[PDB]
Design a binder for this molecule. Structure first.
Ligand code: ASC
Ligand code: ASC
Ligand code: CA
Ligand code: CA
Lengths: 399, 399
């Protein structure tokens, strides 16, 4: 092969270069807006979006951003370890989507850096926490994913597995049985939210739409850059998982189940956007020191997947209620995490803003804030799920 | 349509912000290199490349780049008039390649601004020169294109029509009868040119490859932004030419003849890159006040088209001679234009660098600098063609 490895390396470097270009075009049009919030009132000022959080992670991670690559490879190795020993661990699924791994491990690593831990503590803690989150989350969501997909034989590996598990366990008690697309979407989101800020002439509105288009363009360059940056490496992840665990379960993208229920889409994402709208209204009401700018990606994908599971297990009513609560917890939890990051000693402007990154990981990051022994407590919980998963697997294959 | 109009406007705007993104990445990544050429030896420091010259045009024009659009539309209207009156002008061809129009009218307009003319003078003179160059230069290469393409029914509307004419007539006396593709090409070319600069360690060569990759990424973002920004308005131009002159002859991109001769591509580009290497070697040996950085687009495409026509009319021998001399004239003539634009009162670190933009336009800009009446001279020259050409058309319709 050798040569194709060189091709992959050069292509990934080009990817990170495009990420840097989109980051520059994003910064040169928004630093006087947050720094503009300094010479105004309560500073920051944050955007709920995974790619913006990846940008802020890179910029506040410098050349130490390679720790995210070390932690991604190491965490992937630990997940492969959790699948090879599926008999005593009960973990079958494996995480392989590259950009989701780099986003998640990136935010965890930047958390362990804002606190101020060493390099190896960040790589090891990030690897263990991320591997347990992937195997336990997807392996937890395997069965209901089989219920939604009609037994297709794959699980969900994204950023809302635990929230979708709250929808699976809570739904039966509430109901009865890409250029201009993303640019227009996220741009319209920025313009709508800016119009909401107006609730607290054609020239200023034209600058609203133009700010939405500059922001959306920057985010899109970031999207393509990240995708090409993790494309070949994730393809190698499939190359190794292809041979080490050939009969494993794949934790693929959440969108891969949207076609199994295209009805919970616009409605689930609709009430998720309503939840985030109400939550941002509450934030602007209480004069909170943190302003949240919602994004299209976590709304549509997170609240639409939770809309899918809440639809299959609890109909449109469970979609409305549970998805609304999910959006509120998304915005409020993101602002809370940003408060932690600010008090920990670093100015961070982005956050994942998904469902499992503004509901389940805020309490974990707060747990590491409280005690360094909270991590080993999380490991004991991982054994609590692990031994029972082993017993259920043994009593599930032999019976 | 109404809706698709505002849609297309949003599209062109978005494309323009992508252009600004690649531009910011480019100048932000390569400012200290030319500024380093200030604090060392002779300045400039120029890039033979169409998209870089378009970026520098948008830079040295700022909020006055709309004049380029005005001159593009007006020149289009003038060409439409010349084809409507094809009986008394002998003009069959019509240029519709929009991005070539914006590049050419952009450089001519930015020359008519750097010299200090007003808005209406720059728009009028640029529209006239562009209309006469497109209609006359593309109308000249109609029949030889029919001989090369076997009568495929189109002409060539690009950047080397005049050099293709000098090759067509100079040839018979000399012989017997796209992401990582462009990024890889231009990156390799930057590494080669930097290797020739070294003709005057792993960290140094790896940073050569990294600077070439950054420049390639910036140039590629500029490419996508230009194509998107132009696609809609050029599609409107084609929509008007569909109904005003349906039976007209289309002057299309030059590469559409490469399929009729895939052999002259790598050899014409071979001796063209050789000519660029020799001429740049002369600019380094003579200690010229202007350094020249070659680009992949001018070499490959200019010397490729000239290699195809000079191949059809004068074999591999005329390919070697005319392509080599054409490359030398490319480098030396472009650096010439950079010298004149330097004395005229501004700095311009990059030129179109194609065949006709280093052989035919340097003397035009020099003549306009000397006396403005020279412009009127060209106008009279057009009549010396048009009138004559007029009769020819009749002598080829009824005879
Ligand atoms: O969290 C994310 O969701 C989308 C996509 O993976 C969903 O299909 C994306 O690009 C992310 O970073
Ligand atoms: O001048 C140019 O030549 C190439 C292409 O048109 C040749 O096919 C390109 O992208 C330009 O902008
Ligand atoms: Ca490969
Ligand atoms: Ca169209």
């Amino acid at each position: 092969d050798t040569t194709t490895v060189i091709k992959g390396t050069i292509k990934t470097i080009v990817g990170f270069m495009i990420v840097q270009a989109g980051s520059g075009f994003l910064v040169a049009n928004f630093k006087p807006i947050i720094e503009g919030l300094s010479k105004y009132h309560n500073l920051t000022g944050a955007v709920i979006d995974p790619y913006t959080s990846m940008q802020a992670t890179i910029q506040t991670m410098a050349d130490n951003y390679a720790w995210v690559g070390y932690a991604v490879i190491l965490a992937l190795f630990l997940n492969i370890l959790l699948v090879v020993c599926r008999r005593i661990t009960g973990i079958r699924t494996i995480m392989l989507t590259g950009h989701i791994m780099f986003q998640q491990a990136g935010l965890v690593a930047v958390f362990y850096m804002i606190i101020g831990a060493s390099m190896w503590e960040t790589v090891i803690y990030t690897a263990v926490l991320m591997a347990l989150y992937w195997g336990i989350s997807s392996n937890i969501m395997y069965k209901p994913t089989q219920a939604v997909t009609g037994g297709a034989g794959f699980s969900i590996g994204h950023q809302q597995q635990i929230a979708s598990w709250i929808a699976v366990k809570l739904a039966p008690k509430l109901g009865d049985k890409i250029f201009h697309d993303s640019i227009s979407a996220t741009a319209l989101v920025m313009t709508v939210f800016f119009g909401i800020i107006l609730l607290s002439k054609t020239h200023w509105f034209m600058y609203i739409f133009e700010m939405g288009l500059k922001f959306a363009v920057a985010i899109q360059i970031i999207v393509t850059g990240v995708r090409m940056f993790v494309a070949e490496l994730s393809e190698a992840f499939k190359g190794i998982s292809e041979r080490v665990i050939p009969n494993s379960v794949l934790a693929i993208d959440c969108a891969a189940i949207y076609a199994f229920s295209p009805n919970a889409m616009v409605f689930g994402f609709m009430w998720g956007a309503i939840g985030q709208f109400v939550a941002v209204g509450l934030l602007l009401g209480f004069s909170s020191p943190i302003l949240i700018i919602p994004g299209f990606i976590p709304m549509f994908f997170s609240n639409a997947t939770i809309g899918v599971f809440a639809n299959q297990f609890g109909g449109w009513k469970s979609v409305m209620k549970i998805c609304f609560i999910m959006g509120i917890i998304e915005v409020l939890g993101s602002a809370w995490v940003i408060h932690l990051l600010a008090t920990q000693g670093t100015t961070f402007n982005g956050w994942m803003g998904m469902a499992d990154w503004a509901l389940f990981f805020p309490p974990i990051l707060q747990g590491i804030v409280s005690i360094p022994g909270f991590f080993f407590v999380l490991l004991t919980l991982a054994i609590v799920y692990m031994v029972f998963a082993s017993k259920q697997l043994r009593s599930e294959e032999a019976a």
